[PDB]
Amino acid sequence: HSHGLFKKLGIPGPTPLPFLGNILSYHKGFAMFDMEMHKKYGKVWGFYDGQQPVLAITDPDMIKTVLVKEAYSVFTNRRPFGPVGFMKSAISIAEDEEWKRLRSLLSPTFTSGKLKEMVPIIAQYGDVLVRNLRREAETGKPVTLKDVFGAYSMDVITSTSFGVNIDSLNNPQDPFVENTKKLLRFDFLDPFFLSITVFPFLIPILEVLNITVFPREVTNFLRKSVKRMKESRLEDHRVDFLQLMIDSQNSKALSDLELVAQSIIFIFAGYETTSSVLSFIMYELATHPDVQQKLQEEIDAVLPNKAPPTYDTVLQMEYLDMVVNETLRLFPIAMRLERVAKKDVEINGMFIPKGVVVMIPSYALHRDPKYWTEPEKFLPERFSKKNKDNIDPYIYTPFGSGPRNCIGMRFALMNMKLALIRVLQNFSFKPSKETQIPLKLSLGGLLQPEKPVVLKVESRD
Amino acid sequence: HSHGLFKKLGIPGPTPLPFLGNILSYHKGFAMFDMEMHKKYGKVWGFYDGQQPVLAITDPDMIKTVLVKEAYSVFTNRRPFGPVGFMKSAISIAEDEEWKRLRSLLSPTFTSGKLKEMVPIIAQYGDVLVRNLRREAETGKPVTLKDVFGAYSMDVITSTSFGVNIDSLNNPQDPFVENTKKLLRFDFLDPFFLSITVFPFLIPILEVLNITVFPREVTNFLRKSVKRMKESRLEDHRVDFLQLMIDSQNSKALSDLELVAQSIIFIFAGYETTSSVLSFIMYELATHPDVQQKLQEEIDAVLPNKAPPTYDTVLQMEYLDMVVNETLRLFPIAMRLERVAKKDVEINGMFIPKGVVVMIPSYALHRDPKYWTEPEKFLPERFSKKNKDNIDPYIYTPFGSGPRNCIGMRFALMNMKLALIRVLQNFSFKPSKETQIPLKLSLGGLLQPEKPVVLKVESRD
Ligand code: HEM
Ligand code: HEM
Ligand SMILES: CC(C)C[C@H]1C(=O)N2CCC[C@H]2[C@]2(O)O[C@](NC(=O)[C@@H]3C=C4c5cccc6[nH]c(Br)c(c56)C[C@H]4N(C)C3)(C(C)C)C(=O)N12
Ligand SMILES: CC(C)C[C@H]1C(=O)N2CCC[C@H]2[C@]2(O)O[C@](NC(=O)[C@@H]3C=C4c5cccc6[nH]c(Br)c(c56)C[C@H]4N(C)C3)(C(C)C)C(=O)N12
Prior knowledge:
Chain A is an alpha+beta fold. The first copy, chain A, has helices at 5-8, 29-41, 60-69, 96-106, 112-137, 145-161, 175-182, 191-198, 203-208, 216-225, 228-232, 241-246, 256-286, 289-302, 311-314, 318-330, 362-366, 409-426, and strands spanning 44-49, 52-57, 143-144, 337-340, 345-347, 350-352, 357-360, 427-431, 454-459. Chain A has one domain: CATH 1.10.630.10.
């Protein structure tokens, strides 16, 4: 009955099927689906994830109304996502007043003073990463980036969050390593999540039985592990997220269960994200020696003879920033952004009923010919001081936008840049024979390459 | 995963869809679906009602193996049908040893001695039907057959079962009339039954909450009504099903709840069936004056000057029997017959795994060009002594076949014939302007005409 909504409002889209709505259209993944629909329906289309109506918008003004203008009043929350348990209190899952409160309590965590203080910790692991990478370089076997960057992502996360200093790559069997690395982003296209989309009525049944998409084993270890590194350990001032969160309950307020839910979500949100992007960047660099050479030239020029990177020097590297940005354009890992209309609204011309998920298809927008010349091409120059004025911040949205944008944006940029600097100071990266060209994306619900990125690593003396 | 079954066995059929299986193919009803599939897959095809695999067979030998040969050992039961409650003990729904026991206890009910004893009761209402029909005839407004035959069906059922003598047509507000006539055959194509097919896992949930497809209001009235006409009434020897059922517990055995479940199922099975067929017969007769004239000539010849029909005279009317049979050929109301394989089996060449519903598509078989010359044509002669040897009893199956065939077959034939005799002794039937020609069947899950049959009635003096 909800399947006549877009018909009633006179909005075009793919004709839904009883029960399934439009989900069979996901056979080629989210990105493709969004590309095809944009191409054939233009600026706005409507579709159904089961019985849930989703309105895709592509108009920059419209997008700002949703993400910025009407955030607090109408578009405050993401779609509710499944059986969730105690993780319901995680910032990214929280709603309305719960969210606003957690956002407030957690903002001061990601400030530049706190961030500049985090530099010497996250640098210590630029060194470890080099060390590991060279061990593969002088033995000379084509490297798997996700493995080495994955290892790197975790090391910085553990240490910056809790202070659990561990070489995850060489310690694969470490109890903290086994738990955390299980925490991977959800494929909303897998069988179980498709079942939840078609039968959302089953969610409360799952919630009552303490079933939750976050593996109970993982969340338990940490649940009572954080308990040790507060009461058994830190009960006596260190530089990490946990402290910044401990002292914050020490004046609002923050319960014990909430605090762990945030610690978990910083990993789940932070871990695969940082390493997928760092892996995509290297791919482009390896397939574009000119851009790599030039980046290495900017790095040696700024930090001569392998000087260590600092907060101020990172911000000073223009081409570095251009390369990170162009990569995010091609591979914005979120693919889509989403808000639910709490109430009925009329955004710039069109009426949107309560409960409709309004979706911004970031990937299709990033690769749109009507905003981007040769948008399949990797062209850092797009982002140079001269060109980067012709870039709409609501067409280009790798970190979302508005009050509910990526909270860890600054931290993530900084982290990746530091990783990239140390690595490029010591090594060059070249295509192996197993390297797939062009790169192919997983037809799954995740923006990742269909085969893992394998690259040849060579020292620079 | 069950959707690769027919692929694995190398059996052809329509490719199923995730979850839905093949149910969208029912958009034109059961009969059409079965016709199309036969035409395009030949002798055997496989399809999925949701996740339930159904094997259609059309080979007469094969059909006899299922319906007759392997009934007791392998093909004992129909598919389980939904939330059912106390009606689980109704003969037509019962399984294995429960069924075999009820079949036994109820066989002696439908014998010809009992049946010949039922004649004077069921005749009393041939008279009532004439009386009502004439009231419409001399006022001269085109009659709706279902209404008058419906009324007739019930009158004979109530009286033959319980002894509740009521002119249902002129007593539409009678408390026994309002209850019973709500009891109509299930449309397995309506929304609720489609939901149960796609989510059969919900059935036990429904059963626990005492939800049941037989309306609780209806089943309750009778439940405690039968209680009155046993203890308050018959506790003191009459000719009816109830008695035949009362004395049978008076020697195996029969519980109180069972007895009512059978009383209900004789109505639900008997009521719409008798009147749908009686309505289809009149349609053919009205659209074929030659056949009507001839039938009336056989009736006057056997029962001169309006003599009342008897058991022996009914059996004596060949053309009558030919007309009833030809109509059932065109409109076998069951459309399909079904058995579930209790275990794995290998019927004459092909292997059939446990749980597969094996289905005989009676309607398509009745209208098959390879067994029937001009099978769309209404040609009683098909069934004359000379031709009726060329008729396979497993191609032609209006009352099913084997140990689980229609238990009320003899009673139903007799009842319809008596109705037809009295009616044709007094009246002729002619097409109105609202009469649709040719007749169109409901695209629903029931074999009924898309518009109700309206015919002009005229006295014969
Ligand atoms: C390349 C790396 C990263 C990318 C591309 C990324 C991207 C995004 C995007 C697109 C959103 C959606 C915001 C919206 O709805 O508009 C988001 C939200 C979020 N990100 Fe990130 N992110 C990254 C790294 C991180 C890290 C390292 C953290 C934690 C330290 C983090 C924590 C979050 C949180 C908590 C939210 C939800 C904020 C809220 O709803 O209140 N992210 N991110
Ligand atoms: C024109 C009228 C009727 C037709 C065409 C008809 C047809 C059928 C058919 C095709 C079956 C399926 C048997 C099988 O699976 O092979 C059946 C079963 C049955 N019929 Fe009828 N029927 C009619 C009237 C009646 C009446 C009047 C009664 C009750 C007095 C009745 C009671 C039953 C019962 C109880 C079964 C199930 C037997 C069992 O499973 O043990 N039917 N009928
Ligand atoms: C999933 C939550 C718990 C994690 C949170 C987070 O903390 N992240 C930070 C970096 C990445 C980001 C996140 O994973 O990615 C985010 N979003 C998602 O993962 C979106 C959420 C979806 C979803 C949730 C529940 C039921 C569903 N049925 C279907 Br079909 C989908 C779906 C599609 C799916 N879309 C397209 C992606 C944003 C960037 C938009 C998100 O909210 N993330
Ligand atoms: C339904 C039961 C309780 C009544 C019993 C009966 O007592 N009848 C006597 C005369 C008619 C006959 C009956 O109604 O008709 C019978 N059969 C049916 O009504 C069949 C049963 C079906 C069914 C049951 C449960 C779930 C389902 N999902 C789907 Br898709 C279907 C379905 C299709 C449907 N088919 C094709 C018809 C026979 C003649 C075959 C039957 O068993 N009847």
